[PDB]
Amino acid sequence: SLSISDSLPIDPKNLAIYQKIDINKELKPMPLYRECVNVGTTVEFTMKINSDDW
RNA sequence: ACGAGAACAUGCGCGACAUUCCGAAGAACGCUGAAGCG
C-alpha cells in the first residue's frame, strides 16, 4: 500500500564532497569522503497510500 | 462326347464440402547500497 516515487532530479549545485568523522568520545579524521547533498536542500517525492491499511 | 459350350461383377463415378487450435490472463510481490571503524 505504501508507494514512494523516485525523487525529482537534484541540482548538481546541491552536491558536494564531505569527510566522515567517527566520534568515539573524540573526533577522528578517517579516509571517508562521500558525495552528499548539501544541507538546506529540499527533495520532492510523490507518495500514494490506501486509506484502509496505512 | 461332363445341364454342357463360350461369357471380366463390370462401366461412370475426388472421402468431399463448411470450419481462425482460439477465448480470459500485468513477469510482479516483498526488498534503504548498507553495517562496523580502524
* Alpha carbons A31 and A10: distance in angstroms, whole number: 26
Nearest nucleotide relative to A31: CA against C1': B38
C-alpha cell at A10: 537534484
Nearest nucleotide relative to A24: CA against C1': B37
Which positions on strand B lie below 7 Å from a protein C-beta?
31, 37-38
CB neighbours of A12 closer than 8 A, spacing ≥ 6?
A: none
| Distance CA A17 to C1' B13 in A | 97
* Alpha carbons A42 and A53: distance in angstroms, whole number: 28
Query: Strand, coil or helix: what is A16?
Result: strand
- Structural resolution in Å: 2.9
* Alpha carbons A44 and A54: distance in angstroms, whole number: 20
